[PDB]
Amino acid sequence: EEEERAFLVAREELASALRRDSGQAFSLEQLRPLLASSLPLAARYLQLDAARLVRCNAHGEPRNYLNTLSTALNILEKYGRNLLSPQRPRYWRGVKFNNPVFRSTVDAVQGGRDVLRLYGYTEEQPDGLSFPEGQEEPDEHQVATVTLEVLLLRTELSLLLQNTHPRQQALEQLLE
C-alpha cells in the first residue's frame, strides 16, 4: 500500500525528468523507491522483460554475465536517452546490428534486440531495426518509461556486483 504507492509516483516522476532533460543523471537515492521496493518483478517492470533478460543470459560466473548484461543495458539506455533529447541524432529512426559497439554489447545478450522494439524500432530489416515509415516523432512517454526500466535493471545489476543491493541476499537465491 504505502510502498506500492511511492513506486508508481517515483516511476512517473523520473520518467518525466528524462523527458525534460534526457542527459539528467539519477542518484541511488532518487531510484531508491524503485530498488528497495518489495513489489514483485511483474509489477516493477511493465515493459522491459527483466525476468527473460536475466534468465536467458545467466551463463557462467555471476561476476561476468551480470557485467555483460549491465554493459548491454548501458548501451540500450543511451538509445532511449538520445530519442528524448531535443537534439536527436541524424539517424534516430534506425539502428544497425553491424555496429561494432552494438555487436559487442547488445547483440551479445540474448534478447537485447527486443529491447529496441520497445523503443519503437518495430520494423525488421536484414541489417537492423527501424522506426515505422509514417511515425514522425517517437512516443516520449513510451521511450522514457522503457529507458527508466532499462536504467533501473542496470542499476540493480550494478548494485549486485558491488554487494550493495537492498535485496542482495534475496536476489542471490535466484542465481545459485
Which residues make up the interface to ligand SRE (CB under 6 A)? 40-41, 50-51, 54, 98, 127, 153, 156-157, 160, 171, 174-175
Q: Measuring CA to CA, which residue among 46, 38, 45, 41 is closest to residue 1?
A: 38
Q: Contact, 149 vs 46, CB < 8 A? A: yes
Q: Contact, 47 vs 145, CB < 8 A? A: yes
Helices (H), the chain: 2-20, 32-35, 41-44, 50-55, 62-84, 100-104, 112-119, 140-161, 168-172
| Binding to a second copy in span 56-95, by CB under 8 A | 56-61, 63-65, 67-68, 70-71, 74-75, 89-91, 94-95
Q: Measuring CA to CA, which residue among 94, 62, 76, 39 is closest to residue 153?
A: 76
Residue with cell 518509461: 145
- Distance of closest approach, residue 76 Cβ to a second copy, in angstroms: 12
Q: Contact, 22 vs 81, CB < 8 A? A: yes
- Distance of closest approach, residue 120 Cβ to a second copy, in angstroms: 16
User: Of a second copy, ligand SRE, none, which one sits near residue 75, judging by CB under 5 to 8 A according to partner kind?
Assistant: a second copy
Residue among 50 and 146 whose Cβ is closer to ligand SRE: 50
Instruction: Among 48, 50, 109, 144, indicate the residue that binds a second copy (CB under 8 A).
Output: 109
Residues that bind a second copy (CB under 8 A): 40-41, 51-52, 55-61, 63-65, 67-68, 70-71, 74-75, 89-91, 94-96, 98-101, 103-105, 107-110, 126-128, 169-170, 172-174, 176
